[PDB]
């Protein structure tokens, strides 16, 4: 019902609309959420991150990180993503 | 049978020390005492934590509290009063069946060894904690019911036989076995050297600007009474694989080493206490341990 | 295996120096010690701050300290007692599942060299940073267990052989390898010249505050105890690309140069102690560095 043999506008047989910008606007490749990137720079986080401590009950392996970046949706940017060494992002 | 415990059962502190005030004296002139003051100094460190090495750069730079002897006197004096109190087997706020069966259970305990280890921890200067580090000579003056006892450097981890420690422990055991009380005014003289940094009790703080804050009373350097009292009951040499005396605790628990020395091997206070009430025979060292926890105090409820 | 380090693991400071009190003497009149007073001159100037442009019109009457020699004495005398203490392997907050493995991994430490470099930093003048600069004559007197030692010409950068430092290093290594303490009363006499300006240590001021605080005990110019402790442990010539002795840090980090020499290249203390308690073969120099850190002390937890 989405990959049908029609042309529609966001469909697959698209004809007539290739001339327009419609199949590249309404059918977006890797359509994701806003996605801002909170970046860890040498152990110091950029935005509203606040490093936390995991439960240390059954962790087998936990690797630490100092550089890199985490991809946070704009919805969860409102609150602190609370990055942690064991499990990355959550709501707390 | 099987009297379990009162859930409310608690015992009070039978060994009450005062806050150990610190003064600066000379080794020859011990009467001219001057208040060692807790000042604050600022400090530039190197930010050396175990984890991330990439913040080893830039300063650590924070303020802490310090207490040094002034550079005209070379001896640290520590003043406190330790009050041993009797009625040790009565529960202050616990029940009246379990408490009296525990009283009859520990009525034949060896109070002499208990009192000797307490008076030895007082007289060997174990109430001094890091202030003994680099001391030429530790002279302990214990005045008890108008009787002055002077002690030189005694070996602390072993409770070797001394006749003056046994002399004070005679009235301390007479107090602890029955009713009444006794007071020990204890003055420590350690030749720390002119200007040596002393170590008063540190404080627990959360939002303070000081990274380390020392305990003070009107600015004078002082030790916590709970720290001194913890060093009174560092007599436990009766746990499993005993090497050094640890503090008397219901679980033999030392916070610093992070391992409880009497938990998990059925040598804690509560199992022996329930056994002593329920009528199985206790050995002498664990009887002394249970009595030491009773005179330490604590809610043994649960 | 995989003996993971305790989070509470810390070691006490084992080289405890006092504050370096500073006096004015002559070169041939060494007994007449007059205390160097920190003078303080006022400077008139308006405030210029980033956060308050409205307050720049009037204010900031600042009064900056200074310390010179008096115009009748040409020699600056620096007195401090360095206290070396033993059992550097005892953790004070750590425990003994890791610290006992460290004891049995650093028992082969040549304390002789460690102590040599400590007493050489004591004697050669590493503890006299900006006031040994430009002095035509340097002298160090060390008094230790009623023994006097005289040092005149020791270049501070390399640890060359002199039997005088070695003599003291013996008893210092015997303390540090075993149990006990030793105290070196160190008096430095440097002939700078008539009325030459001297250099006390600096208290941390804010970005604003005043220009510079010099370190005062009871009005007299002095230098910080931790700053002398930085001088004594400045023995680290065993990191990769070692040009000059740096202060033994857990990360080999100097703040004033903006670089860390042992951080991030597997020669930091923490990887070496985990290698020691997991038992891989250490060389003599990095094991000596680890023992020097344990002498320095500090909390190593994570």
């Amino acid at each position: 019902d989405k990959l049908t043999t029609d042309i529609a506008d966001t469909n697959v047989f698209v004809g007539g609309w290739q001339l327009t910008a419609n199949p590249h606007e309404y059918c977006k490749w890797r359509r994701g959420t806003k996605n801002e990137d909170l970046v860890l720079t040498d152990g110091k986080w950029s935005g509203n991150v606040t490093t936390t401590k995991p439960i240390q009950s059954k962790i087998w392996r936990k690797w630490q990180g100092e550089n890199g970046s985490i991809t946070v949706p704009e919805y969860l940017l409102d609150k602190t993503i609370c990055y942690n060494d064991f499990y990355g992002g959550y709501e707390n | 049978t099987k009297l379990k415990a009162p859930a409310v059962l608690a015992y009070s502190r039978k060994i009450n020390p005062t806050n150990a005030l610190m003064f600066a004296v000379n080794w020859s002139d011990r009467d001219n005492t001057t208040a060692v003051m807790v000042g604050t100094k600022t400090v530039a460190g190197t930010q050396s934590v175990r984890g991330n090495p990439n913040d080893a750069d830039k300063g650590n730079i924070q303020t802490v509290n310090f207490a040094n002897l002034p550079h005209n006197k070379n001896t640290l004096l520590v003043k406190y009063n330790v009050k041993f109190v009797g009625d040790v087997f009565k529960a202050e706020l616990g029940g009246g069946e379990y408490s009296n069966t525990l009283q009859t259970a520990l009525e034949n305990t060896d109070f002499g060894t208990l009192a000797y280890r307490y008076v030895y921890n007082i007289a060997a200067g174990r109430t001094l904690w890091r202030n003994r580090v680099g001391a030429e000579s530790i002279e302990t003056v214990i005045t008890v019911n108008d009787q002055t006892f002077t002690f030189s450097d005694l070996l602390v981890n072993e409770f070797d036989e001394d006749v003056d420690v046994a002399e004070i422990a005679d009235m301390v055991a007479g107090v602890l076995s029955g009713e009444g009380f006794v007071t020990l005014k204890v003055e420590h003289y350690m030749l720390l050297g002119e200007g040596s940094e002393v170590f008063p009790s540190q404080e627990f703080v959360e939002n303070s600007k000081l990274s380390k804050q020392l305990f003070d009373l009107n600015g004078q350097a002082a030790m916590h009474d709970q720290k001194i009292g913890n060093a009174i009951r560092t007599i436990d040499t009766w746990y499993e694989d005993a090497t050094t005396p640890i503090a008397v605790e219901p679980y033999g628990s030392v916070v610093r080493n992070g391992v409880a020395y009497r938990a998990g091997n059925k040598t804690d206070l509560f199992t022996l206490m329930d056994g002593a009430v329920n009528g199985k025979s206790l050995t002498e060292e664990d009887q002394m341990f249970v009595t030491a926890n009773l005179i330490r105090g604590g809610v043994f409820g649960g």
Side-chain angles (χ1 to χ4, degrees), chain A residues 1-56 58-73 76-92, chain B residues 3-302:
Chain A
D1 279 345
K2 244 135 236 39
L3 291 113
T4 117
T5 58
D6 214 80
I7 62 112
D9 198 82
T10 66
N11 244 49
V12 242
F13 263 12
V14 168
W17 294 108
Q18 250 306 305
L19 320 160
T20 75
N22 292 46
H24 327 126
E25 176 70 273
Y26 306 111
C27 174
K28 202 79 69 50
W29 154 263
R30 305 281 201 204
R31 181 165 265 170
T33 167
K34 291 107 240 116
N35 276 141
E36 103 270 355
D37 261 72
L38 293 181
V39 35
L40 183 47
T41 20
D42 281 45
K44 242 143 163 171
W45 271 106
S46 47
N48 26 266
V49 195
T50 86
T51 14
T52 1
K53 272 269 209 292
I55 322 174
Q56 343 262 357
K58 290 158 176 199
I59 307 186
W60 44 325
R61 293 286 266 107
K62 200 180 47 100
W63 303 261
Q64 342 274 299
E66 239 67 56
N67 319 301
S69 186
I70 198 208
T71 147
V72 185
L76 323 174
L77 136 94
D78 167 70
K79 351 109 188 27
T80 43
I81 208 45
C82 322
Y83 195 78
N84 200 309
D85 209 56
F86 188 41
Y87 39 70
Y90 45 89
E91 331 295 312
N92 262 339
Chain B
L3 330 176
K4 216 184 295 322
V8 85
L9 175 85
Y11 283 76
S12 97
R13 193 188 324 126
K14 295 293 152 303
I15 307 173
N16 305 270
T18 61
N19 285 316
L21 228 54
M22 299 183 148
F23 293 85
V25 285
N26 277 296
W27 190 253
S28 325
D29 178 18
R30 300 161 165 201
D31 320 332
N32 198 320
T33 89
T34 54
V36 168
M37 296 314 250
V38 178
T40 174
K41 72 163 167 305
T42 171
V43 153
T46 74
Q47 297 226 21
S48 313
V49 314
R50 176 164 266 292
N52 46 347
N54 57 357
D55 42 336
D57 258 357
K58 75 216 94 72
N60 204 77
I61 189 61
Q62 83 282 51
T63 82
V64 289
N65 262 343
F66 79 108
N68 293 39
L69 301 165
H71 284 253
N72 42 13
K73 319 162 123 58
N74 47 358
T75 309
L76 176 68
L77 151 69
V78 169
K79 304 281 291 323
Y80 50 93
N81 305 334
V82 171
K83 191 167 289 233
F84 291 92
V85 153
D87 298 273
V88 315
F89 289 140
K90 109 174 293 304
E92 176 206 79
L93 83 92
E97 189 38 84
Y98 184 84
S99 319
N100 316 317
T101 41
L102 194 55
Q103 173 144 350
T104 57
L106 320 176
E107 82 175 17
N108 54 277
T109 200
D110 180 17
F111 269 104
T113 303
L114 249 187
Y116 190 97
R117 289 200 176 186
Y118 289 140
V119 175
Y120 199 87
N121 282 358
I122 302 177
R126 184 187 285 280
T127 66
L128 323 168
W129 276 90
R130 266 250 275 168
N131 316 285
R132 274 131 61 81
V133 153
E136 262 56 20
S137 34
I138 310 158
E139 185 132 332
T140 297
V141 175
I142 297 184
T143 297
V144 54
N145 47 71
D146 193 88
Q147 245 197 329
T148 291
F149 297 87
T150 312
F151 306 97
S152 100
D153 295 12
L154 314 108
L155 257 164
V156 193
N157 266 29
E158 44 271 32
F159 300 95
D160 47 28
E161 329 309 10
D162 181 18
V163 81
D164 276 321
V165 185
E167 194 162 325
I168 310 174
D170 273 345
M171 61 224 67
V172 172
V175 158
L176 282 181
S177 58
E179 301 145 10
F181 85 110
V182 80
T183 310
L184 270 70
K185 299 143 296 323
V186 197
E187 315 336 325
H188 292 287
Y189 304 137
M190 325 90 83
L191 195 43
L192 270 177
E194 243 110 19
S196 143
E197 133 109 322
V198 319
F199 300 97
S201 207
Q202 202 177 331
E203 295 267 52
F204 195 108
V205 284
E206 310 192 348
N207 321 330
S208 90
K209 333 185 307 325
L210 312 167
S211 147
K212 140 163 149 273
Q213 165 192 334
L214 299 172
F215 176 56
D216 54 19
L217 301 153
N218 331 306
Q220 163 143 45
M223 320 186 66
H224 288 157
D225 73 329
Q226 67 258 12
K227 179 97 153 179
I228 303 300
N230 172 256
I232 307 304
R233 336 166 302 265
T234 321
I235 78 181
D236 212 35
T237 64
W238 323 301
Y239 52 87
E240 220 167 52
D241 323 304
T243 52
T244 172
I246 72 173
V248 163
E249 288 306 311
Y251 283 124
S253 58
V254 285
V255 192
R256 267 64 198 279
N257 310 357
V259 48
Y261 282 30
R262 278 157 168 279
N265 43 349
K266 283 169 50 20
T267 54
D268 56 19
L269 159 76
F270 304 132
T271 50
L272 300 166
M273 235 187 73
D274 289 32
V277 156
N278 295 359
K280 45 162 301 293
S281 286
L282 281 208
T283 77
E284 295 92 28
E285 68 280 345
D286 57 65
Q287 224 170 11
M288 277 176 354
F289 167 73
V290 169
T291 316
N293 260 279
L294 283 203
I295 68 182
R296 160 203 186 266
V299 48
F300 318 129

